[PDB]
């Protein structure tokens, strides 16, 4: 049990690095591995990694989470934030097991909106043990040479003592890279669902069949291990309308069809929390489309976001 | 980490009974509960509970595991061994989320045989992290007033250092009743698959979202904790499918009382000893359920673990 994700993250990293149960190479990828590893987070909202050596990218974090909420399988959206992700796209325009959006909101086994069913289930029976969103699909193993098989099995939500608790079940997780965005996204969905239901946030449990550090990340992992402000709360109630507007801005900014000044960002008809997210996308637009870094944009952000930007793009925001 | 399932079972039962995290009533069923609970078993073949006050039923345990291997959703098969399982059947004919057989061998999503796909995946890439059998299905929550939603999410197998390791992921598990048969069946599947692949048996990991004791079982759970050996036999090496097919033939004939076998007939069956003993369990159960003469010579030839289970479960017949 840990207070924040960062504590759990570093502890797990040091477990796998120092005492791997196995060294092997699934699909030719040499790794240090532990089996059946998990942890419990007391404050899932504190979901960010702030160790400068890790250079955690809060823009990608929100982008992935919102990509999931959009229900999209499209590569163009997500690869703009994570260029290496195209390696998992067979067709060069969609992602398959990597795209959790369709798994949540239109699962290929029946075309089911599981999020809605979870909400209904917990509304009809608050104590329910059945409120599960399945991610993995039985057909992913049926075809050979599949380059993108879902590594998350399911996400479960439970209301306990008036608080929404979350559990992520994974068959496999990159403990150094992927875990950072996976735990961010799962706890983001947990918080989002809690606000929708009018509940407080409980604990988050993470459990994984194979947790591993790829040997190709060993140097960077070592640098993070040698190294050594609060994440803001999402506003109460139904955030879908705000998410819809944020997604409109995301696309306009990503395609460089529009740009927002510090004053224009503050003028947006959005809660402060979501204004800052759009601000992250404007900052990312400045990077990607080589536009002038706005220091006034930077100064208005929550400190956690300022730090992430300054460390990730020090030439722009340092 | 525990050596045997009994050690893990008793430790967990004590945790939930005496130190529950929550008290609630999902679907109106008052319970003591802990969230995010699991264990590791170093010796998954030792999968049985022998505490007399628990009255663990080894015949049901094998019947459930074989019911799964048969790929069947039929109620008639399984309710013969566990009459109370009828409560989860909406049609009096089949089970839905309780029936893991079809989920494994012809999953609702595509009709996929996931066991075959797991074996192929591990054959092509021994180190694979992908060898998962999905159990749960997204349509189960879309069924209005569903009385039988799968509580197992998935089973995963990994080949590590020449051993097959197993992981059972469940959204919910009854710590008193269900856990006994679930861990039996999952470790049975694990062993069966290891033998088929020519591997030794690795660790078994059990991971559960909600682990609970129902208040209706509190008195019995207390008797077990207040009350608190011989080894469980190993399944033969190699491909056991042919033996399983033969055992399922005998299972059907004995259950329907369409056949019966004496102790000497059982001993002379053309099966490995391990599987002969399982057929004998079914013959013993037939004697009980169809009111035939108990064969004490049958009882005497069984492994001690099975003798004990029969003696405690049916003391009037085998005590
Ligand atoms: N969300 C994810 N988390 C992750 O940790 N991964 C990583 O990508 C790997 C996919 O390779 P396998 O299908 O061989 O497990 C996982 O083992 C895991 O290390 C991938 C995704 C999907 O992009
Ligand atoms: N294999 C099983 N193990 C189990 O432990 N169960 C128990 O049956 C309950 C089913 O009710 P829910 O769908 O409300 O979780 C589970 O919570 C669990 O307590 C049921 C089955 C299938 O009949």
Numbering used by the authors:
A (entry chain B): 5 to 232, 240 to 329
B (entry chain A): 5 to 232, 239 to 329
Provide the authors' original text about this structure.
In this study, we demonstrated that MilA has a substrate preference for CMP (kcat/KM = 39.2 mM−1 min−1) over dCMP (kcat/KM = 7.84 mM−1 min−1), and thus offers an opportunity to investigate the mechanism by which conserved TS evolves the preference for ribosyl over 2′-deoxyribosyl groups. In the structures of apo MilA and its complexes with various substrates, MilA are all homodimers.
Subsequently, the structures of MilA‒CMP, MilA‒dCMP and MilA‒hmCMP complexes were refined to 1.65 Å, 2.10 Å and 1.80 Å resolution, respectively.
